Design a protein around this ligand. Structure first.
Ligand code: SAM
Length: 280
């Protein structure tokens, strides 16, 4: 029960993909002056210490953010995200990694809003202190999936909903789908970004089945695999499923995925794809 700790994984290849997509979506939303909501259902601590014992045990950040953040030929699509990372590592050494709530905190504007939830008794107080005196943000110790009912639609009528669970309980694979259907019912023009791991390809196929069955349209799938699928290799890939993706997102991902994959996976194994689960 809440035994998952994101500090082991912070800044790994999956975070790099996830936060790339988050930032691009946010930048798109800012192309209109009107305010929007950023909703993070499973928000985490806010930032992560990479020198921590948990990070270095896996050291997964070494094969993720570390391989891209100082590249001189960084694609223009990655600048906003990487400039947030640099902000938290101004010494030029990689010591801290910003979670989704801090990427949002620095990319959102004065008029925009954040609604964040985190249940874990270590991570919640940490997240709360990240947002003291930032009156744009509401931070609660509550179930994230329940927010898709309670907080939608936003008063602004615009927004990004990031659903990023740890999949520690297998039930998450169903809960993400029913959660999205509940959210969509309330706010059908929302942008929903669902992160998923590939541990067993089986469970992803089924999840995508259930998503298709909701009848929701306009669903984009972005996946980066560092290894081919297996049933004995832990997490070999991760992806972002985006409902109502912004107009440029498909092209931006086509622009940046080959570079990303080349940097994250120098051996060239696995794959990286962008395609539609359900077209318009
Ligand atoms: C991996 S993290 C997400 C990190 C964050 N979104 C980021 O990008 O930096 C998943 C988190 O969800 C929390 N959690 C698990 N179940 C939850 C629930 N039902 N509601 C809210 N938070 C949950 C965990 O404690 C953990 O911090």
């Amino acid at each position: 029960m809440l035994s998952y700790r994101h500090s082991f994984h912070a800044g790994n290849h999956a975070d790099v993909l996830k936060h790339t997509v988050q930032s691009l979506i946010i930048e798109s939303l800012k192309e209109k002056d009107k305010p929007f909501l950023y909703l993070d259902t499973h928000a985490g601590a806010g930032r992560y210490q990479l020198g921590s014992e948990h990070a270095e045990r896996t050291g997964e950040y070494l094969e993720g953010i570390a391989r891209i953040w100082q590249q001189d030929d960084l694609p223009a699509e990655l600048e906003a995200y990487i400039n947030v990372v640099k902000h938290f590592n101004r010494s030029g050494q990689l010591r801290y990694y910003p979670g989704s709530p801090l990427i949002a905190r620095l990319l959102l504007r004065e008029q925009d809003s954040l609604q964040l939830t985190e249940l874990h008794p270590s991570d919640y107080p940490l997240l709360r202190s990240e947002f003291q005196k930032d009156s744009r943000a509401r931070v609660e110790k509550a179930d994230g999936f329940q927010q898709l009912k309670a907080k939608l639609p936003p008063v602004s009528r615009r927004g990004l909903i990031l659903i990023d669970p740890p999949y520690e309980m297998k039930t998450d694979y169903q809960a993400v789908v029913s959660g999205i259907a509940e959210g969509y019912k309330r706010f059908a023009t929302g942008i929903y970004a669902l992160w998923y791991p590939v541990v067993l390809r089986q469970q992803i196929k089924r999840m995508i089945h259930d998503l298709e069955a909701t009848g929701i349209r306009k669903i984009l799938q972005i996946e980066l695999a560092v290894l081919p699928d297996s049933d004995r290799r832990g997490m070999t890939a991760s992806g972002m499923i985006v409902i109502n993706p912004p107009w440029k997102l498909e092209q931006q991902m086509n622009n940046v995925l080959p570079w990303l994959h080349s940097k994250l996976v120098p051996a060239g194994t696995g794959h990286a794809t962008v395609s539609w689960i359900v077209p318009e």
